[PDB]
């Protein structure tokens, strides 16, 4: 034959590659203004007899999706106000409640005033979690470890979704297979033009609205048989939770400098009570059956698999930590995380502390102080996976504990790039073939 | 789950001699040398990987899943205790003996 | 360099509270697990647990669920960490030496380890 070298442009093949994704989307801290339009009409492809080795646990996507998330609370953070002054003696009496214990304190405090020579004297009902003692002397927690900022007034904490679109040479790799564990190959493969809707929700033991699975709970872990990796649960149906404050606040305002101004919890107009979020009893029974069942699958059929409370930690780990309308919620999830299960209209109400000095993606120096929210707050969120720590030392004895996670806010990404994957084209290709010039 | 068996607590070896330590273990095997109540270090990380400054005798190779730890030129300082060890999971390691 | 300095040797009385102490440096300490392990006299290793230097989460087994308690306090100008591990119930079996550990992967290959802190009971 003596077949000469035949070049072909457009190829359809492609390389594994990291690139950067740029956002697009149909005030808040996750500036969506900037970023494309994204186009009414998605483009699927599926791509039939096509397997990828897809790998979760090593996308790049999700370390770009964690420093772009960052990079955008910093950003938001940044040209506003600062509370450099209010780090001084707080002398805090309690609340004028007859009586959880300590909860509100008043804390008046000297301030400074427009007028660098002069002082007022203000006060404002901060937390028992933002103050901490020095028998009347108090001082807000983030004094000797961190510069505190305030959170920023008019922009919203509210989570919208964002999709991660691919630039031109590069494509995303969806895996349309069900019951699709994080790594190996997947044989339903999809190139689309950009990802699903992702909220960039952060939570901890609980991950709150995102994507629901679609046939079976789904258990996900880097290593089933290593404790120091945290396995991610996916829902098949979500589990409706209702948090809510109802202490009704009241904010005012105070001039700490020219131009700059500082919100107080000023009054509570109405009764003491402790913030909480119910949980269907029924309903988190049931989803907890189907856990089990999928975690036996893995762990063997002969397994007293119970769920604990978490160990300790920091406040952000230990307790379900969320952002609901602005309030920072810290939920003791003992009530969840409960039961011992063996090989065969009622709630449950957890207590959740209320945090304004925040310090978030794990970092210190940089605390944040949200301001505190007008009257009561209300949220319904879908708890559609967990993130779950087991305990070591099995010894191949069954009775395998399994606690919730932290907050490394990495698996919460995981959570929803798990199936997608990002490839280069390469169109240039070179075969044999009897053309010949 | 983790299976672990190693070799009989207490093999003697003379200078000059080549000894292997069989540990058969399902998981990840890093290879210990304990010596005397000290902290253990670490000669071996995973299956065949030498540890940084770790002397260029100590040696292992992973067939199916025995690992073997073969040793050559043994000296007096090396006569200490040896264990494998697959995560959290230590057996009671051999003592060399001379 | 990496080092991981222990506290001095501990005797208690039986029913009492215990504390090891194990000042970590020399590293970006936030990145790697640091593991506790316990050596009984004569006798093989044991896995006391692992804490997150992020996180501050422990991680111990069944047997000793309820007594121990890692901590960790990481000192102000970011300089030193100290990983604090508290044993509450104390009995006859606790006589050994405690070792702190860095894992440094997930091979749990434990290249740095502490002096060991031998208590008695």
């Known amino acids: 034959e003596n077949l000469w070298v035949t070049v072909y442009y457009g190829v359809p093949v492609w390389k594994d590659a990291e690139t950067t994704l740029f956002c697009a989307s149909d005030h808040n801290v996750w500036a969506t203004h900037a970023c494309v339009p994204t186009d009414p009409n998605p483009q699927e492809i599926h791509l039939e007899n096509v397997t990828e080795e897809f790998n979760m646990w090593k996308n790049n996507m999700v370390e770009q999706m964690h420093t772009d998330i960052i990079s955008l609370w910093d950003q938001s953070l940044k040209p506003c106000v600062k509370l450099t002054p209010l780090c001084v003696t707080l002398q805090c009496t309690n609340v004028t409640n007859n009586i959880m214990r300590g909860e509100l304190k008043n804390c008046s405090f000297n301030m400074t005033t427009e007028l660098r020579d002069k002082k007022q004297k203000v006060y404002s009902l901060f937390y028992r979690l933002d103050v901490v003692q020095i028998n009347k002397e108090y001082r807000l927690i983030n004094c000797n470890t961190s510069a505190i900022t305030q959170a920023c007034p008019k922009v919203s904490f509210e989570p919208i979704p964002i999709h991660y679109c691919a630039p031109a040479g590069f494509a995303i790799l969806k895996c349309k297979d069900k019951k699709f564990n994080g790594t190996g190959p997947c044989p339903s493969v999809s190139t689309v033009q950009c990802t699903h809707g992702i909220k960039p929700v952060v939570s901890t033991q609980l991950l709150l609205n995102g994507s629901l699975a679609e046939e079976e709970v789904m258990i996900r872990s880097e290593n089933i048989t290593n404790n120091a990796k945290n396995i991610l649960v996916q829902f098949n149906t979500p589990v409706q939770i209702n948090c809510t404050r109802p202490n009704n606040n009241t904010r005012k305002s105070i001039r700490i400098g020219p131009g700059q101004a500082f919100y107080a919890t000023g009054d509570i107009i109405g009764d003491i009570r402790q913030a909480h979020c119910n949980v269907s009893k029924a309903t988190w029974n049931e989803t907890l059956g189907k856990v089990v069942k999928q975690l036996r699958k893995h762990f063997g059929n002969n397994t007293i698999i119970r769920f604990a409370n978490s160990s300790g930690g920091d406040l952000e780990v230990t307790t379900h930590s969320f952002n609901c309308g602005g309030e920072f919620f810290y939920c003791n999830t003992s009530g969840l995380f409960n039961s011992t299960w063996i090989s065969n209209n009622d709630s449950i109400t957890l207590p959740c502390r209320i945090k304004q000095i925040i310090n978030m993606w794990q970092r210190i120096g940089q605390a944040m102080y949200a301001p505190p929210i007008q009257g009561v707050i209300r949220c319904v969120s879908n708890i559609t996976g967990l993130i779950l720590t087991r305990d070591g030392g099995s010894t191949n004895s069954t009775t395998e504990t399994f606690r919730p996670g932290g907050g490394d806010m990495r698996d919460n990404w995981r959570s929803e790039l798990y199936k997608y994957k990002v490839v280069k084209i390469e169109p240039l290709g070179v075969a044999p073939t009897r053309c010949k010039r | 789950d983790i299976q672990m068996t190693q070799s009989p607590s207490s093999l003697s070896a003379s200078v000059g001699d080549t000894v292997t330590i069989t540990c058969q273990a399902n998981g990840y095997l890093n290879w210990y040398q304990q010596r005397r109540g000290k902290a253990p270090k670490l000669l071996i990380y995973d299956g065949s990987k030498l540890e940084r400054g770790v002397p260029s005798r100590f040696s292992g190779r992973r067939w199916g899943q025995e690992y073997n730890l073969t040793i050559n030129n043994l000296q007096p300082e090396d006569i200490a205790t040896y264990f494998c060890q697959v995560y959290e999971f230590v057996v009671p390691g051999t003592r060399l003996d001379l | 360099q990496v080092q991981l300095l222990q506290s001095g040797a501990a005797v208690t009385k039986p029913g009492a509270s215990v504390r090891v102490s194990c000042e970590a440096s020399?590293?970006?300490?936030?990145?790697?697990?640091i593991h506790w392990w316990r050596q009984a006299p004569g006798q093989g290793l044991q896995w006391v647990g692992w804490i997150n230097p992020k996180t501050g989460q422990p991680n111990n087994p069944r047997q000793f669920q309820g007594r121990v308690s890692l901590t960790r306090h990481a000192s102000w100008d970011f300089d030193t960490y100290s990983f604090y591990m508290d044993l509450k119930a104390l009995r006859s079996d606790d006589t050994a030496v405690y070792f702190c550990?860095?894992?440094?992967?997930?091979?749990?290959?434990?290249?740095?380890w502490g002096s060991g802190t031998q208590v008695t009971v």
């Open positions: 550990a860095r894992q440094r992967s997930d091979y749990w290959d434990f290249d740095v």
């Open positions: 020399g590293y970006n300490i936030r990145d790697y697990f």
